[PDB]
């Protein structure tokens, strides 16, 4: 059984970053060469492992987290980074073991007239913990007066749309991101490289 990376990387649709998707990868042979050897990926950054050595290693499980952000935010998907995405949407731990893979998805995720279906969280009182997800849509209280669920002055809907049009600057173009995290618990190693 080959690991279902096809379903991860070649999926028709991707998650918004605030509602980022996680897929557990288990009980399979993981050929990482189809990935690291590819010209398809403009980010391929590995932490606590060497990408060239991936086909040699076994892990308890692999998790594939996936979502869309804009080009200029891809740098935030790395350990020790801060910003609206890292702080309020998707957070890697300082001691991350895994790989960050990204590619430009302008051709799929932009639309003439703008694609507004991808959202991120703009307002949040505190930073996310690593691998935390917040899909809440409570009106954000920016003053001393309670909002009572009503959008207005000092009372902000917490989510904002990206506006992806194909002729956007690359900083404003959509990028698909896949985060592979590797766990090596005191348990059987179910995900092994072919070699």
């Amino acid at each position, epitope marked *: 059984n080959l690991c279902p990376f096809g379903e991860v990387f070649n999926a028709t649709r991707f998650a918004s970053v605030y509602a980022w998707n996680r897929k557990r990868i288990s009980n399979c042979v993981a050929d990482y060469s189809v990935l690291y050897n590819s010209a398809s990926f403009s980010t391929f950054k590995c932490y606590g492992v060497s990408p060239t050595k991936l086909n040699d290693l076994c892990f308890t499980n692999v998790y594939a987290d996936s979502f869309v952000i804009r080009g*200029d935010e891809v740098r935030q998907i790395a350990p020790g980074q*801060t*910003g*609206k995405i890292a*702080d*309020y949407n998707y957070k890697l731990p300082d001691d991350f073991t895994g790989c960050v893979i990204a590619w430009n998805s302008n051709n799929l995720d932009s639309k003439v007239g703008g694609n507004y279906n991808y959202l991120y969280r*703009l*307002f*949040r*009182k*505190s*930073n996310l913990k690593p691998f935390e997800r917040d899909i809440s849509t409570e009106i*954000y*209280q*920016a*003053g*001393s007066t309670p909002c009572n669920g009503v959008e207005g*002055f*000092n009372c*902000y809907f917490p989510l904002q749309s990206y*506006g992806f049009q194909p*002729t*956007n*600057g*690359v*900083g*404003y173009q959509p990028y698909r991101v896949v985060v592979l995290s590797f766990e090596l618990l005191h348990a059987p190693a179910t995900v092994c490289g072919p070699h």
Partner: antibody
Amino acid sequence: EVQLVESGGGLIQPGGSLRLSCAASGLTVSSNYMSWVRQAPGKGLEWVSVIYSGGSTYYADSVKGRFTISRDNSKNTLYLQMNSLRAEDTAVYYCARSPYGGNSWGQGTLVTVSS
Amino acid sequence: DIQMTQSPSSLSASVGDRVTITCQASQDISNYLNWYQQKPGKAPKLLIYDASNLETGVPSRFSGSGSGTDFTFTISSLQPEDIATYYCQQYDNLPITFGQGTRLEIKR
């Protein structure tokens, strides 16, 4: 409804330290994106620093390693700690809700760096 | 950094004239541009947010347009109280950057 009142401006020697205050009413400082922006006499506007609600902080390259932005929740006050001050830091310093949320600016406070 | 080039540096115009100021961003800033009016010794006041939106309380003689890199700010009919320096600002990218300003002078 929103009032931002800066204070702490005055003469300070080159290499000296000064802390600016911005007392807010009608918003919660710690709940907002809050910035300092400066304007040298007869020149344009220059963004200095930002603090996010979650606490992340960013700085203009010109003030990197010298200035610190901070807040006190109980006083509902934003601060800018300016160390190792140079003549080029002479400016009116404004606090603002920036870059997101309702657009509000204080009246400003003038800092002079001179021997 | 994103540079904001503002034109012209200064203009002189009569009461009643249509006035046009341009701002150009050095890379795409979508519609995340603000226009401010600064009267000497006072803080900048927001006139136009997100390229084209009139801040509440601002007279309807003020307008703005544009998206991407090219932006314009217009006073349809210049009033005496419109003597100020006008700044563009891109806000969605750090560092936040401003245009150099347009000093608006009146001929009489």
